[PDB]
């Protein structure tokens, strides 16, 4: 009930994780 | 370890190991489960029958 419902995040949607698939092949 | 077969935890940084006992706690809060059940019902009957 604290830092949960309406505030949300406004990140971690698409563009952040979409880049992570490229990092696996860069190592 | 997640299957509750071997009880223990390792150390990734130093490559060490730790000792972990099976029981994690005792029976304490369980006694409060009977008290919260009576105070959420009988207490409601205390006000209704009096009023």
């Amino acid at each position: 009930e604290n830092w949960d419902d309406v505030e949300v995040d406004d990140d971690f949607t698409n563009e952040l994780k979409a880049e992570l698939d490229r990092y696996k092949r860069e190592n | 370890i997640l299957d509750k077969i071997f009880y223990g935890v390792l150390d990734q940084g130093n490559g060490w190991l730790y000792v972990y006992e099976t029981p994690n706690q005792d029976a304490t809060y369980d006694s409060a489960l009977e008290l919260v059940g009576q105070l959420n019902k009988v207490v409601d009957q205390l006000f209704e029958k009096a009023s």
Partner: protein, 400 residues
């Protein structure tokens, strides 16, 4: 009528391909000719906006859409009066003759029940309950009791109402309680957990979904793959790893749902990666689960980001329980994430008091916080004192 609402739901938000809306448009165009969708057909532009909601030829005249088949024409206008005369006016005079001739009692009640189904075909919810209201007094056995609930159940899926539906289903069960088979009982159970997905009740929605059988198919109310998705996917976010082993990954039913329909990829790809403790490939499985399952489904769009983030919190929690510490190169690198993105994931998890751990910078050692001898006699026990202190003196301070 759920087949129309399920396909036309893709018209709301599509971030991948437009063809998902074009393929789903074929079901809307095909079913609108057999049964009038006008209340939901107009509700398409009146529900969500700034995608397809700006295209209407009737109420407000504008065109913005990725699908041009949602606009009115002269064919639907003529068929609107034809369905009202043929399916209602023609059959209403025949029932009117039965009321004047006084033929039977229960047979006249079933006439308004059968006619009430035609009001759902033309999309009239006001007269649908009015016809069932006259047959409600003559209803005795479950034959006429469930049929009244069927129209109320259509209010939830067809009209998108999570309020007035679940309130009436509890009243019908309290009147005559039998239950019939599992499918008649799932209508009082499985649908109850569906309405709880809107208000976000967490486990309260999945309580009756796990015990529900996978053979439940209501057709117009719900399909076979619809309940298969709501039961299998929601049960993964609720049940912890202790219940995932003996229920989700091993089931006589759930395993047959994803085997028949390969578009799920939830109870298999996610549970095996959690069981094999391999999180490198576990992350991209969430994208295929979020984009191709969670988004296209109707009632799975309520939570949105509350799905994956709860799994992102529990994916590291399983690793913390198996080791007293953790390395940075095995977490922020080997798992496919980065250093800045991992710090943002776990940065908001700790202050919410969901879990406890220790993060380091110079050493880069992730240490697991354990309750040790604290457990429930440290906080919960102290919190129990004030928890029962207020409620005890609440009714005692007012006397009478």
């Amino acid at each position: 009528n759920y087949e129309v609402s399920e396909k036309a739901f893709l018209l709301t938000q599509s971030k991948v391909s437009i063809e998902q809306r074009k393929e789903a448009a074929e079901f809307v165009l095909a079913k609108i000719k057999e049964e009038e969708m006008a209340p939901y057909y107009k509700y398409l532009c009146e529900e969500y906006l700034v995608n397809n909601g700006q295209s209407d030829l009737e109420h407000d005249e504008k065109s913005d859409s990725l699908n041009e088949w949602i606009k009115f024409d002269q064919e639907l206008y003529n068929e609107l009066c034809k369905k009202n005369e043929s399916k209602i006016k023609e059959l209403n005079e025949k029932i009117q003759k039965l009321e004047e001739d006084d033929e039977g009692e229960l047979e006249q009640a079933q006439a308004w029940i059968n006619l009430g189904e035609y009001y759902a075909q033309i999309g009239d919810k006001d007269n649908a309950e009015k016809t069932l209201g006259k047959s409600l007094s003559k209803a005795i056995s479950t034959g006429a009791k469930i049929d009244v609930m069927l129209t109320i159940a259509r209010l939830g899926f067809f009209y998108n109402d999570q309020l007035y539906v679940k309130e009436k289903l509890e009243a019908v069960n309290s009147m005559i309680e039998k239950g019939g088979d599992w499918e008649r009982r799932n209508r009082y159970k499985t649908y109850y957990g569906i309405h709880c997905l809107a208000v976000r009740n967490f486990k309260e929605a999945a309580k009756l979904l796990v015990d529900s059988l996978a053979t439940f198919t209501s057709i117009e109310l719900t399909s076979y793959e619809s309940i298969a998705t709501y039961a299998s996917v929601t049960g993964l976010f609720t049940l912890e790893r202790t219940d995932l082993k003996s229920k989700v990954i091993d089931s006589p039913e759930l395993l047959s749902l994803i085997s028949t329909t390969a578009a799920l990829q939830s109870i298999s790809s996610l549970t095996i990666s959690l069981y094999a403790s391999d999180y490198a490939s576990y992350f991209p499985y969430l994208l295929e689960t979020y984009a191709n399952v969670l988004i296209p489904c109707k009632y799975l769009n309520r939570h949105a980001d509350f799905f994956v983030r709860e799994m992102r919190r529990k994916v590291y929690a399983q690793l913390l329980e198996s080791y007293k510490t953790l390395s940075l190169k095995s977490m922020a690198s080997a798992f496919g994430v980065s250093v800045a993105f991992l710090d943002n994931d776990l940065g908001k998890f700790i202050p919410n008091k969901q879990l406890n751990c220790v993060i380091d910078r110079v050493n880069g050692i992730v240490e697991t916080n354990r309750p040790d001898n604290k457990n429930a006699q440290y906080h919960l026990l102290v919190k129990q004192g004030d928890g029962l202190l207020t409620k005890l003196q609440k009714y005692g301070a007012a006397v009478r």
